[PDB]
Each structure stands twice: as structure tokens, then as C-alpha cells.
């Protein structure tokens, strides 16, 4: 059955969603899970939203990712309208019409990080490491928790992901490369790929490593 979560809404507007979910007996939860089917996002008129964690995780889990307007229009027409008419089209970072949410729904058989091992390394802010890890895992990557734990082999593609400005004023995220054999990329590599549901090239996200 349907199971909704909401993102980017004023607890006012959350009020309307709660009233609507109560009216229709639709599961509404405050935390997104494997079972969530709909992530209801605040959008402008063209169904373009901001990127919140729930946004990424809705895309990563191939969920319906849908504008708040699906709820308000549905109330207005007293009928469960069609998600397709309200699917989020893009976000204010990666493009107003990149259609990630659709691609992710359509690509569960060819997940963008299939074949990758990813280590989410060093401090992060605003997104618990294990949610970043869940996000890559959803997208098909196998999750590695310590550098010394990358599986070796030429069939393995390791990647280290870091958020440089969560680090202490010391530039130690350039010395990760002497500790393992992988490319080292910013967290925006993940976030952009996930949003676009397309694996981006590392190139513009690589962090140079001291030898």
C-alpha cells in the first residue's frame, strides 16, 4: 500500500498532508524507510525542488518523488490524482528538468553504483554517515567502512568519498591516497550522480592526493 513522507514543507503545510492522509487512510510517517512509496516535496510551479536528504533517498530507492501539489490538487479535486502528473522534474542544483526521479524509477535493473565499493570517510555535516552509506547502497554500491577494508582485485572499483569542508583546518584529506589505492572524490560526486540518477565522471570531483 501507499506510504508517504514529506520534505521541505512548513508544519503548516504538513498539516494539510496529515489531514489528507487521515481522510484517505494513507500511511504517513515522519521518517523515510524501505517501505516508503511517496516522497512529497515542496516544489515551485514547474515541479522543481530543493535537495534534502529525503529527496536523495527517495530517488535512490526509486520511489515516487512527487510535488506537494499532488496533495493540494488532490484535495481540491477530492480524488487521488496521478503521480505522473506531479512527478518532480528537477532540482535547483542539477537542472530544472533532468528527470532523475523518473530515471531512478526506471533503472532498478541497472543501478548507477553497481560494481563500485564506496568508503564514506572522515567527518560529514548535516547528513549522518550511515544515511550517505544507505544512499550509495540503494544505488547498488557495496559499502566499505574502513580504508584498510577495500576488497582488492582488478574487478573491484574502490572510491573514497569525503566532504572537505567538514574537515579541521588541517588538509589531511590529501593524505588519504597513501593509505589506499582508490580515487578520492567530494560528496557532491555522490549527490549529483544520485540526483541525476546518472553516475557522473569523477574528474571534476577528484581531490588531488599527496604522494
Amino acid at each position: 500500500r501507499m506510504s508517504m513522507v514529506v520534505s521541505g514543507l512548513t508544519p503548516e503545510e504538513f498539516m494539510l498532508v496529515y489531514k489528507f492522509a487521515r481522510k484517505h487512510h494513507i500511511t504517513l510517517t515522519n521518517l523515510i524507510t524501505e517501505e516508503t512509496t511517496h516522497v512529497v516535496m515542496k516544489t515551485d510551479a514547474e515541479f522543481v525542488c530543493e535537495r534534502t536528504l529525503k529527496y536523495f533517498l527517495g530517488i535512490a530507492g526509486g520511489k515516487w518523488v512527487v510535488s506537494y501539489f499532488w496533495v493540494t490538487q488532490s484535495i481540491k479535486e477530492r480524488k487521488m490524482l496521478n503521480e505522473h502528473d506531479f512527478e518532480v522534474r528537477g532540482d535547483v542544483v542539477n537542472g530544472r528538468n533532468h528527470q532523475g526521479p523518473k530515471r531512478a524509477r526506471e533503472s532498478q535493473d541497472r543501478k548507477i553504483f553497481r560494481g563500485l565499493e564506496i568508503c564514506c570517510y572522515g567527518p560529514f555535516t548535516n547528513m549522518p554517515t550511515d544515511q550517505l552509506e544507505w544512499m550509495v547502497q540503494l544505488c547498488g554500491a557495496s559499502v566499505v567502512k574502513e580504508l584498510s577494508s577495500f576488497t582488492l582485485g582488478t574487478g573491484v572499483h574502490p572510491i573514497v568519498v569525503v566532504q572537505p569542508d567538514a574537515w579541521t583546518e588541517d588538509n589531511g584529506f590529501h593524505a588519504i591516497g597513501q593509505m589506499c589505492e582508490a580515487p578520492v572524490v567530494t560528496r557532491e560526486w555522490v549527490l549529483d550522480s544520485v540526483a541525476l540518477y546518472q553516475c557522473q565522471e569523477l574528474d571534476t570531483y577528484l581531490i588531488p592526493q599527496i604522494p
Binding site: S7, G8, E50, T52, L53, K54, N126, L191
Partner: peptide
């Protein structure tokens, strides 16, 4: 309240 990622 929910963090945004720009």
C-alpha cells in the same frame, strides 16, 4: 529545519 544541499 531539514538541511538543504546546494
Amino acid at each position: 529545519r531539514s538541511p538543504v544541499f546546494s
